[model samples]
Target: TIYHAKDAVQATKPDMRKPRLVVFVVGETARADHVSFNGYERDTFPQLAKIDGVTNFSNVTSCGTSTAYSVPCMFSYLGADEYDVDTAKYQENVLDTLDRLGVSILWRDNNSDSKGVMDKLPKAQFADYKSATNNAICNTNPYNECRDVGMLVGLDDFVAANNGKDMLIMLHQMGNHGPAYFKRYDEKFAKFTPVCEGNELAKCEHQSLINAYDNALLATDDFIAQSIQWLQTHSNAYDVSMLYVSDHGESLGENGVYLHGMPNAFAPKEQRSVPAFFWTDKQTGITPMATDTVLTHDAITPTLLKLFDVTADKVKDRTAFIR
Candidate 1:
């Protein structure tokens, strides 16, 4: 068979009310240490810091430092060591499992794309979401990319379209995809001074580069906070929640490394440590885990399945430590 779901996917909560509206925000090139929510010195996430239900898991690691490797690996039922790219390609990932269980899936990508993770889904719901005509914030950058905020442009209509359904909206962010970090956000978010406006990261002064990076994170902070706000607006209508995780982290001239995708052995903490958080409108059940709990991408699928109260054949053994 084409898919390796092992058995059919089923919704455990057959009598579920307040249809679940889960917003899964996947970030690109977001480092853990630089985010204020993860205990960074600078206030890189002041906007998120103000949000009460937000839980920032500090000691988190990515499956890999590259998107192609980390994205699919995190979504599969297989753990990091057990993950195989070839096998994952034909397997039923979290999204597919949710789809089978009657969860409406929407993938709005502001990043390069979903890295083929959204390929199996119906085309009507998958958006490579880059357009100047759609929103004023989009297509105004060097790479002709939209700002991360552009992903939320059609919230009211999308929600109206999927009314009364248990829907999962996956937002893939173009977060700090560097060298041109200056292009990642609006000028008002340029709180840090002396940013590296040029494309050559190595040429900029170290502090200036760090400043540029933090500014990008600030943009992400606003994006995430806004996402939560959007979810909150419709919380009365649905059992709304948000799960945010970076596909991988980046290396910012640390020990002479300028970019990501270092071989596992050669990768530094900066390249693997990613910032992650969760927020739910039903925020009571969650007991906050300590920052040092040490989470990996392996927990993602299980956590997601648990979030929607779904059971699947190839689901991971344990849900997230927080749960």
Candidate 2:
């Protein structure tokens, strides 16, 4: 089974130095429509907006409804429609694409759910390691469970250590990932006057879930902003670029659906529309296009290859890069 995913690693030649590194941050269950940058009322993303070299994709969508299928699907070379990747489909993985092309890959974690996406790739690094048993959602402070600040702290150290390496560092976030929204943020962030505690999607009130979700998002945005600031302060490292996309989105008591995992075909914008961002070092002179341009997870591989200055031999889709 040949994973059609390209490898930027082998694609490298002598004089061509890829951007210092690639940061692929996968946000959990964040809906594009709810994001303040996309026009939601709450200012949940002050940091992301201020990140100089970043390109915010105001109108991007995910390919699937559930994380189990969507996360793996996002990393795989297969398009969402034909997302059958057993031995029959040639099993061309994303790493295979990059490995075949020469891109170095790394898989990090917030939780242990790799979903077998890392099985084919060379072993990389996993920072800020912790047990899901101590998951914040279950502990005294559930918001601590989603502390990407911990992840960012490790990432800063990683960049310093791996400067000049053309690599992909995948950071899977743990914020806003629940029927347990209250656990996703601190009490100070609980702005909704009347909050609900019910975890059942059909039972929890809409406003309560939304308030918690929004606060968690605010924290995640800070993670992004802090990461970018770290890069700026350490300019001596290889040039940096970031792409933030979610595996799937969550539903906030919309149409009787409280969380995600709904049928991809039937899910509404709440469970399907995903937020995406494209960011590069400000020195690159790359300007972001209008959000009206339709973008999907299907376009990620080709865009990444383009960003790395590599060519993908086999891909699900290749839309024009957002520059």
Candidate 3:
């Protein structure tokens, strides 16, 4: 059964209403050090610069550098010792926890590897997710590499089909996932000079790969800008909040490493620093402000439940406004 809050008091007990909608843009294979907001030299995120409500969490870390375990464990979002350093036992994921607690979830993905946990719940439906067969780019059929705009189209259609329901949408972008960085953007967006054609991160010069990676960040900025506009439009019927967090961070030729999955001992900020943002309507009554406290992937699910005022039985490591 779908749980509906009769009012703010009934929702969180102390009186708070859920954000009408919460969108989580889970970026894949992105390193924060490569993003301009974190001091990268390129003008990669032009779109985000124009957003008045955007916040940039300069120092954030992912639970793990690898996707396999990091993903399921991070989304579990359990607080306290359960979410603590121990990884021996993987508990319930956010989908399971939220469904049991009655939060509707809808996942719209651009990549196939992303839907593992999200596609399973009844209330949590998944679509347009790239399956290897459906991906025209590598299939030799020559379709555009998956674009971020597909997310807007998917969300727009979903909102039109179902209205006035509190919901969560997972938007996973095919972000700077490399070797194909040039393909992520058009030649026109190739603002950085002297980019390398080689796909290997270590083989390419630092600036060349940085240029390619910046292009992906640019894509993310644009995607978020448009998504904010959509949320604003939906505000008349439902309060909305959008949060973005990368599943795991990426490595760009740091210590001779081209990508992520390095042992934490050697992982630098490039593989750990991720961008987190939040936006909500005035009606939601949750005033998010910037803070320097270290935040990570473990807090995401709990934060969503808290926004809905649901008493989530979990541990959330850190919560702070994006700066």
**Candidate 2 per-residue C-alpha lDDT over 99-175 given as tens digits, one digit per residue, 9 for 90 to 100:** 55545566666654556666665555433334433223324364345455555554555655655556677777775
Q: For each candidate in turn, give its C-alpha RMSD to the true structure in angstroms.
A: 2.2, 3.5, 5.0
Candidate 1: tens digits of C-alpha lDDT, residues 33-67 = 88876667999888888887888887889999898
What lDDT score belongs to each candidate, Candidate 1 first? 0.80, 0.65, 0.64
On TM-score, the leading prediction is 1
Tens digits of per-residue lDDT, candidate 3, 1-323, equal 22222121215321134336777787777776666677877667787777766667777788777666466555665443344334423345665555554556777667555435653465337666454332333332244465665566646667766565567787877776666676766554667766666765677778877777776677777777778887888877677888877766777765777677776677776776777777766676666655455677756756766766654323333553421
Q: Please give the clash total of every predicted structure, in order.
A: 0, 21, 6
Best by lDDT: 1
TM-score (all chains, Cα) for each model: 0.92, 0.85, 0.82
Query: Clashes in model 1: which pairs?
Result: none
Measured on C-alpha atoms, candidate 3 has an lDDT of 0.64
